[PDB]
Amino acid sequence: ALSDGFVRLCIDPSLNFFGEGCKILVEGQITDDATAAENVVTCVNSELDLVERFGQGSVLTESLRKVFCMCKSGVSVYALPRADAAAAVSAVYTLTVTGTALTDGRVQLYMGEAEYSLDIGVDEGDTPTQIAAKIVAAISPDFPYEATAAAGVITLTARNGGTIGNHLSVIYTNLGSCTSVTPEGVTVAFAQTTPGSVNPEPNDYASVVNECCFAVYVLSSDDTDWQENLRDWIRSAWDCSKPQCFGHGYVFNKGTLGQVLADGDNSAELSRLALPTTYPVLPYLTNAAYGALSACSTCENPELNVQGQTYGLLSCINMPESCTPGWEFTEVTQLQNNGFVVSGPATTSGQGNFTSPYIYNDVTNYLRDEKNRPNATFRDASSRRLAAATGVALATFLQQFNGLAVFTKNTNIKTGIIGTNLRLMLGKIRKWASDNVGVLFSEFDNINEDIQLVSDFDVQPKCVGQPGVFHLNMRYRPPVRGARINVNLVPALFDN
Amino acid sequence: MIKPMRIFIGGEELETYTSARLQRTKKQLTGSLTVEIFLNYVPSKPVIVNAVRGKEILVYVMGELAFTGEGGSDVTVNFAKGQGYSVTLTARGRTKYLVDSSHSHPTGSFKDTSDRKVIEALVKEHKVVLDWQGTEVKEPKITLRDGNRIFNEIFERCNQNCHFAYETRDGKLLVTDGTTGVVGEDIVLGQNILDFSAEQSEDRANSEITVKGHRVAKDVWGKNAIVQPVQSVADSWVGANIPLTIQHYGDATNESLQRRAKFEADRRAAESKSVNVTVFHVWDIGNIHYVEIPPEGIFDVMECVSLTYSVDAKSTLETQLELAP
Amino acid sequence: MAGPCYNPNEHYLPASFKGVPFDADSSDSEHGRNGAEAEFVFGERTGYADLGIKIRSYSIRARFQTNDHVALSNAFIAVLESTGPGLLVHPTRGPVMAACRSARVTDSKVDAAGVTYIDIDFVEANDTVTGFG
Amino acid sequence: MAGPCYNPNEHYLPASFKGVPFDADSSDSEHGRNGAEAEFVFGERTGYADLGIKIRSYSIRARFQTNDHVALSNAFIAVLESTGPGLLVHPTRGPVMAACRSARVTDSKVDAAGVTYIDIDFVEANDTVTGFGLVGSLIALALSPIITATEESFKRYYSPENVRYYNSETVIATMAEAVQQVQTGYLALSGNDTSQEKWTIVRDFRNVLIDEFTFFDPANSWNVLRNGFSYLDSAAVGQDKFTILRNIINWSSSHSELDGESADAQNAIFSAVRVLATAYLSKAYMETVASTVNEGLAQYDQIAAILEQEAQIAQEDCHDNEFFLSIREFSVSVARVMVNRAYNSPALIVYSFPGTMHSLVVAWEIFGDAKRSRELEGRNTGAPWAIGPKVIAERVRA
Amino acid sequence: NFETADRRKRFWTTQVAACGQSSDDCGDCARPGLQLLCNGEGRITIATDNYVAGLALNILLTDASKADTGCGWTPGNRGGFWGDSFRSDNMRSGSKIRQVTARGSMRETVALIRAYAIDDLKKLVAYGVAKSVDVDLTYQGSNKIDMTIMIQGVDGNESRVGLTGERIANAWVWS
Amino acid sequence: NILLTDASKADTGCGWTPGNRGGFWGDSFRSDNMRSGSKIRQVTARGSMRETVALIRAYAIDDLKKLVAYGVAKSVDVDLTYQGSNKIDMTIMIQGVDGNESRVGLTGERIANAWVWS
């Protein structure tokens, strides 16, 4: 309503700009400094608002930072902060510097993730370890560990209690030869002195996320019991006892091959990421990146697979190349055959150089069946997304029969009446199902038998059914994404 | 559209010029012109015939003067059993009487003077205003051949002093030893060119030019007048041995030998880099332009040597140039 | 034309040439303007230059059905061949000055006996002074 | 079209020409591109080239049916015959400027009475200036204005015959040193030359310095200084002149310690030399390819600072107002070109690879020809086998 | 040198809801304008975020030159901007969405409005700010009508290789 | 080698990561005007399985055709049979020649690079 404007048009734009067609929930722990209320879901706007709302260096803050770095736009983020246990212990690490710098040089470190790297120049020759260990003054504040800068040794104490702070491996410079002169006679030793003790086990998912639909759940923890509760909640969301709120969850498991294989509880509702014992990056950062990428930031098309070096590239993570593949090939096959997600370096490069990880197979943790038979109906992640899309799409289509007159006893419809019967109803549904081939379904083996419509008067006994209730029975198959062929080869020395 | 070209004869406008063409070249002594006119005739009724074999002619291009007869120096009336009946005209610079009149000098041999004071007494028999901007040269002897045309002697005497002799657009006579210095347009390929044709011919270049000639000074003879006056000048652009030798027609002076030598070098060098360009829609010759033809790598300043405006009844407006460095 | 209240005799002028009436059967014309389209080399832009008006031209077709058509048709040809241009009343373009440029007379004795068609090709001709400007 | 839900009035624009509406009945166009295909003799291969866009053409057919259609038709023709081109609203191609090229009007009184058809043939017509185009140059600097501006300033103050007599010797001695600096620079650049002109130039330098009265004339002093730099600039092309010119600028950063007018006669030599050196240094920077945007701009800042210093000196107390204006205008002209070179000469861009890679592989992935890897050496540090993970390369302009 | 070589900066940018919303019985609307940012000791500064979004607002909310009518307009409101006679890209500023006229049923008029909106925002691709733009307009009733404009941006640093099209110039605004 | 190597991928308009654009960096030095590798893994599920299989055969022929171009073999042909959902077979026939010419009056030509005699 512009008084001095032109006559015919009045634009009147909206205040904000975004769609929030899909939502993502990130769950983790916070620190004392955080102002956000615990166990209450809140919306997250941008990185400028972080730190204060979720403490400095907290597990939740780091996970959120990577989520925003991947889904720059096109998805709405939510956070569910949690508090530490009653008697949680904090892990402690030690880094001792020994010797005296004999020449000018520089010292550089890599810990946890590339964002926390530091590079400071040693002042000059004849600087003892006390003047060294200035590394503390150079460590970034966001690092989840607190540096104390003791007399000749620097101690790193986790900012969050529990087992979460039990994953380190340091790559360092001052032990070999480097053009960026390593101050000769200086070395560093790495060791641990105290592990984490206790993790929280919230069990109130029915009260805080009571009846809200979330597309993707992300959990930044390694407690098996905590993950088990999340899976049970997802089951209830997919349950048949009430309207559904579909969703999916992402978790990670770390350890040796034997330990990892013991966590496969045939979870059709979770995608368990498997990592080795010597991963040079903090675990939850990688898991958060995978969840963020797999969120609507990429999966607005349910049938899209998040794999390969083009789609499943966790660009927001940088890690140096390791001396050994980590997951041996004989072990990679076993993990994939057992329903686990395995990641590896994107580009082969020189030993010690920087690279990025990518995902081999986008597969859930589904195995066997309710009747204990083995199948792969929900093996691939896209199957879950496609199934949810089919349910919503089918329900919308059937809405046109709401309040429509239905004739069941005498199937002839008078002239001028607006109605329908069973056969006409079934025919219309087949047209919809067939037309959707190539978008939500593959070619039906027998379309004449995979769709059935029956009135409630034919299922219940005499004088027990209700008027105007139907039963629809359907079977479908998602699009095929594979093929095998034999390549019999016959180099034949000529003979016509 | 505002008439980009208007033609005037004797003050009465030509409203039926069905075609036109105006040329102005720096390597001659007079421009030219040509106008085609539609003429009518109806039998057994009166007609009016001008048939003026001489009168002033002017050409204005886009509200600017571009030629000055004098005019109507030639008239022809074509005719056909078929297509139609028309007339043609022609014109040349105000100096078009020098190019066709044998000199009538009062005596026929100067005693001692400079070239400028000679060019004034030869042309001022026909009332043509000179426009001198070069450097005066003093010589002991000048005797113009008996009956030699005016455009022969001026051209002959100005060749040994590196003086270009060409006509301006206002009706004067300009003798210059360089460029007018009026900076023009940057003719860039892909912007205004329509066609081009560069060239580099080795058949018209010489690395070493030698000049010889005796002396005529008031009192000189012997060795100082025969075997002494020899001078050589070299180009150094052609990397081959193509010697040439020239004979001097005049009173040889060591300064004059090089000046004649340099004049030949400029003529040969320009003739070995001739370019042509067409620039579609319709200021002056001798200007300085920039060109760009990466295919042959033209990235050097250029100076125009000839100009041409052409029109047609079927709307073909064009303009041609002959660049050379 | 729209509506059934049209009246062709009221909207089309009666043809003529040099004052002799004749029955018209068609009416065409040609107009235009002379351009100088030019496209540069290696360039993504073109140009244009308006350079005068184009000479018109009219074409008409006549039919003779009345009794003794040969006398009228054979007498009208003697007018098209008369020297010089003259006024022409185009059926739709109004009175203009034109000069006949050609005319084909078609006739037959067995295929079509009793009607003569004659096509014409006129050209605009404006008088000009003889002193060429 | 598909489905019965078409509304032709909603997808076809209403035709028009020069503002007068009319009813359209057809719509065509003719696009294309000019080729120069060539086939060789006895060969099994053929080539091709590109020569620019081909001029378009449009054709429309109009129908009239209303009463007195002759008047509307006979009145629309008067618009086609008008002069010059005008806007045309093509039914499908939208607004575009054209120029009618012909039109055939068909009508009848017995075969078809009451309807008039007209076929038109348009042509695209883009306006053009009359001086066979007029464009600007952005590939070279203009040194004639600054050099002439410097000449006036130098001539204005440097006058050894009017300074107080017990300072003429010192002022002249300074001038001799200034020329000597140019002489040293030239001899360093053309060390390996053995032409017949090097001997002549060297002799000319020696003669001028040996003679004593040559510098008593302001005209002679200026000519030697200007010409000496001209030979220096043409001695070598490219990076060879960076060190030589920087040394001269260093020598010309001093200021005179005399008093009164005598100081001006000496500061004139210093100021004139530095401005001339800076101008020629800028020209030298323009004969080389910018290795990187950051490096290319760093070179420019080095020049703007020097020119800015001279402007302040020439405007300290209205010492030379005209010179101050000339310096200021030259600096902005230099910026217009130096900035363009850094940001647009090869049009560099930063890439983001997923890890370190060989130079050969990087070249193939980006451009598609491993032979282009030679260009990546100068822009990216790191060994040839460890380039990355961020690479600076050229823009692909397929 | 340090990998942050791109030195190009970003000037002020118009933002939606800069001066709040104007409320009326019909509905609530934004009032775009410049944004002021304050420091801890005064020293106010203007914001510069969302460059492309700010540029889009300028295109839509400005009348362009009006087409000739044969009756004429007063010199005050002929439309356009006098500064467009110096630009060389051969384009005119502003938009013409406000110049539509009621033609045929309401459905036709709405369709025409969409046509103008595309024809105006198409300039964004020409400048090189965005690689694609599209507007979806829906008609659902006499008084309720909505329109959504979608713009496509790119990241500052190239990551993909082998694009069918071309990398848009002036992409240093990364949007 | 020809079959088990990914050739250069066609442009898509969205792009590919620099790591896996396909092809081989050494193809920029060869002068025969060809590119290495095969593109049989770049097919996509289109229509019924019968159509997809037919396309796969087309790519296989288009790749192995390079063998005749090099001159190693005088002819190649692949026969593919579809029998059901999960059982598919493909047989590749390659024609060879003896080391020493024995027949005279061949319609075609003796393939160069036949010193491998196969």
Side-chain angles (χ1 to χ4, degrees), chain D residues 10-78:
Chain D
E10 179 177 318
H11 290 96
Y12 290 82
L13 300 170
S16 293
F17 186 59
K18 295 198 188 199
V20 304
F22 77 102
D23 184 9
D25 208 344
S26 284
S27 303
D28 288 2
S29 311
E30 309 207 332
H31 324 267
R33 185 161 280 282
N34 279 350
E37 66 266 12
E39 51 199 1
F40 323 106
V41 303
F42 303 110
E44 309 289 319
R45 195 81 181 288
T46 50
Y48 178 87
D50 196 333
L51 298 176
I53 283 186
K54 194 204 300 308
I55 188 173
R56 305 183 175 75
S57 68
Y58 316 92
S59 75
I60 315 178
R61 181 178 182 96
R63 179 196 282 125
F64 302 94
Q65 309 161 301
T66 313
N67 270 314
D68 189 358
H69 53 86
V70 292
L72 297 178
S73 177
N74 184 28
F76 180 60
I77 297 169

Side-chain angles (χ1 to χ4, degrees), chain E residues 64-90:
Chain E
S65 191
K66 291 173 180 165
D68 302 333
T69 61
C71 189
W73 312 90
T74 52
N77 71 341
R78 202 191 178 201
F81 181 55
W82 65 269
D84 277 323
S85 56
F86 298 111
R87 69 196 284 171
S88 58
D89 56 10
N90 189 358

Side-chain angles (χ1 to χ4, degrees), chain D residues 277-298:
Chain D
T278 294
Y280 276 103
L281 173 55
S282 293
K283 164 172 189 201
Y285 280 134
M286 281 275 157
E287 289 166 354
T288 184
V289 176
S291 55
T292 310
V293 179
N294 174 215
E295 175 153 29
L297 291 164

Side-chain angles (χ1 to χ4, degrees), chain A residues 65-72 110 113-115 279 281 285-294 297-298 306-320 343-347 354-359, chain D residues 351-355 389-390, chain E residues 155 157-160, chain F residues 17-18:
Chain A
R65 273 191 197 289
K66 297 306 189 181
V67 172
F68 274 118
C69 201
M70 208 78 66
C71 318
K72 324 193 81 63
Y110 173 87
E113 204 278 333
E115 266 294 335
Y279 201 47
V281 168
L285 297 179
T286 298
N287 173 32
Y290 175 30
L293 177 65
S294 169
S297 180
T298 300
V306 186
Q307 303 178 17
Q309 310 172 25
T310 295
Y311 298 103
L313 186 78
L314 315 182
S315 72
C316 299
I317 295 172
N318 274 359
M319 37 173 266
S343 60
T347 184
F354 272 24
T355 70
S356 300
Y358 88 101
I359 296 169
Chain D
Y351 290 78
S352 186
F353 272 46
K390 296 208 208 296
Chain E
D155 291 332
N157 297 2
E158 182 66 0
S159 187
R160 295 289 185 269
Chain F
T17 50

